[PDB]
């Protein structure tokens, strides 16, 4: 979470896990709501996925906050800061004069 | 009569407002599915009496389609913005050179 | 006949492993937790543990918890960033169960008071009609 | 799964169909693509897959929106990508009547526009692309109505659903371009001017956000940007 | 730039700047009606 770009990649990598958890839970719920001994296995496997989805979502929001912070920190660097490091001012001053 | 601390507080609130619709949509679907999951885990979930879900197996495919669409949308969104940032960085380096 | 809605599987309350034991022995346990938090390195890993603690905390719900959050935040001010405040700001909205108890608890704690203005739903705290009018104008401008 | 392969087939079919057309880039920069140049099959949303009719019935409009977005994105990442993007951006205008909710084209159209404004490499490309957006202004001014507006009347507001985020975003871009102030090539000033003029022409003169409320401008210095000082 | 006797446009810019600003200052001082508007504008963005 050093810069805008890395924070963005990390947010995406968390989104992926959240998505796969959601898809598994939707599949299990569609199986359970389908028109025994299968529904018991479904309702048994459910809570493990439940207390994984919450972790994924919490982490996702944390990264979203962090990347908003990083972007806003990046946007304050003005042009003079980036331009203070130029090597030879002499040629530049000659040019402008 | 408003003091200084209150003014600084409202200033920091305005300086951080963001409106990102795909993200809010994805998180909305996350909430709308985890509420139903937790309700079914409770066992007295509903018969669509309250406004938390509908167990009807005729809208489950709607939930899956919406999940896929919103996930893809948010994915494309963060992809676009990171590409735009890389492009701005490249152009700044070019003009500095 | 929509569903049996009969649930044979069940889970007992053996959770809160990191926030373990009785809340009894309160100050010794609280100082131990603060010391353990300050101990950890590799900030990332810290965040992980925090999640557990915080959700465990919201299992219970109070003023003692608010004082504990005060100690945690104040200990975190020594460093540059503020991770505890952001993680409370998310894990307050993320869980399934909630109420206005969160509004009151946030109204009580003054340390992360500005972090709450930053990210969460803080329309409540900034209640001075002058403040909200200034807010509408500053936003629209 | 089903939807992913559906989208892949659809994007392939779209790429082929749009590669078929002959319209050159400079021809479309100034003249709108007429409706005749496309078969009524491509319109009305009767396309190649047409197999998940019951499955894809759930959300129809959104599907076209996301597949068009992905098309624009993958083509943009030129004189060819710009051509495909412009053709898609005109297609979404021409296919309005067939949509389920005809008004919903507005928030769709603008949406795509924003995306492509983001993907342009450098202000050179932005100035090469702008004559398009200056050609089809009168399409922006109708937020939801499907019939053209009388020349000189706009129905856009600062806080309405279409502009609620777009004005915020374009003001962000303007602020960032203003913030450089040292490393600004003339291309940058030309770009900022084009943008401010576009936005100022969109909203009417009278809107609450089209005339400043008494802000006396600081940063008026005319120095040689900390060179030869 | 300013004292050349052959390029007079810079002096025209300076004179124009003075005239604009003095116009505003005079209206501010004398009118006592725009003063209320500018006071309101300064206040609303910053009550202090």
Curated annotation (Swiss-Prot), chain A:
UniProt keyword annotation of Cell inner membrane present: no
Residues in the signal sequence: none
Function noted in UniProt: Component the THO subcomplex of the TREX complex, which operates in coupling transcription elongation to mRNA export. The THO complex is recruited to transcribed genes and moves along the gene with the elongating polymerase during transcription. THO is important for stabilizing nascent RNA in the RNA polymerase II elongation complex by preventing formation of DNA:RNA hybrids behind the elongating polymerase.
Residues of the full protein shown: 6 to 105 of 261
Subcellular location as annotated: Nucleus
GO biological process, alphabetically ordered: cellular response to azide; DNA recombination; mRNA export from nucleus; stress granule assembly; transcription elongation by RNA polymerase II
Subunit structure: Component of the THO complex, which is composed of HPR1, MFT1, THO2 and THP2. Together with SUB2, TEX1 and YRA1, THO forms the transcription/export (TREX) complex. THO associates with DNA and RNA in vitro.
The name this protein goes by in its record: THO complex subunit THP2
Annotated GO MF terms: nucleic acid binding
Curated annotation (Swiss-Prot), chain B:
Sequence intervals crossing the membrane: none
Localization (cell): Nucleus
Something else known: Present with 5910 molecules/cell in log phase SD medium.
Record note on quaternary structure: Component of the THO complex, which is composed of HPR1, MFT1, THO2 and THP2. Together with SUB2, TEX1 and YRA1, THO forms the transcription/export (TREX) complex. THO associates with DNA and RNA in vitro.
Role of this protein: Component the THO subcomplex of the TREX complex, which operates in coupling transcription elongation to mRNA export. The THO complex is recruited to transcribed genes and moves along the gene with the elongating polymerase during transcription. THO is important for stabilizing nascent RNA in the RNA polymerase II elongation complex by preventing formation of DNA:RNA hybrids behind the elongating polymerase.
Protein name (Swiss-Prot/TrEMBL): THO complex subunit MFT1
Lineage: Eukaryota, Fungi, Dikarya, Ascomycota, Saccharomycotina
Gene: MFT1
Residues of the full protein shown: 2 to 98 of 392
Swiss-Prot record, chain C:
Extent of the signal sequence: none
Localization per Swiss-Prot or TrEMBL: Nucleus
Domain of life: Eukaryota
Self-association state and partner proteins as the record states: Component of the THO complex, which is composed of HPR1, MFT1, THO2 and THP2. Together with SUB2, TEX1 and YRA1, THO forms the transcription/export (TREX) complex. THO associates with DNA and RNA in vitro.
Note: Present with 521 molecules/cell in log phase SD medium.
Primary role: Component the THO subcomplex of the TREX complex, which operates in coupling transcription elongation to mRNA export. The THO complex is recruited to transcribed genes and moves along the gene with the elongating polymerase during transcription. THO is important for stabilizing nascent RNA in the RNA polymerase II elongation complex by preventing formation of DNA:RNA hybrids behind the elongating polymerase.
Family: Belongs to the THOC2 family.
Protein name (record): THO complex subunit 2
Organism annotation: Saccharomyces cerevisiae (strain ATCC 204508 / S288c)
Encoding gene (name): THO2
Covered residues, full protein: 12 to 164 of 1597
From Swiss-Prot, chain E:
Cellular compartment(s): Nucleus
Listed transmembrane segments: none
Top-level taxon of origin: Eukaryota
Function: Component the THO subcomplex of the TREX complex, which operates in coupling transcription elongation to mRNA export. The THO complex is recruited to transcribed genes and moves along the gene with the elongating polymerase during transcription. THO is important for stabilizing nascent RNA in the RNA polymerase II elongation complex by preventing formation of DNA:RNA hybrids behind the elongating polymerase.
Additional facts recorded: HPR1 is not required for sporulation, and is not essential for DNA repair. It is probably not a DNA topoisomerase. Present with 1340 molecules/cell in log phase SD medium.
Binding partners and assembly: Component of the THO complex, which is composed of HPR1, MFT1, THO2 and THP2. Together with SUB2, TEX1 and YRA1, THO forms the transcription/export (TREX) complex. THO associates with DNA and RNA in vitro.
Name of protein: THO complex subunit HPR1
Gene: HPR1
Full-protein interval shown: 385 to 432 of 752
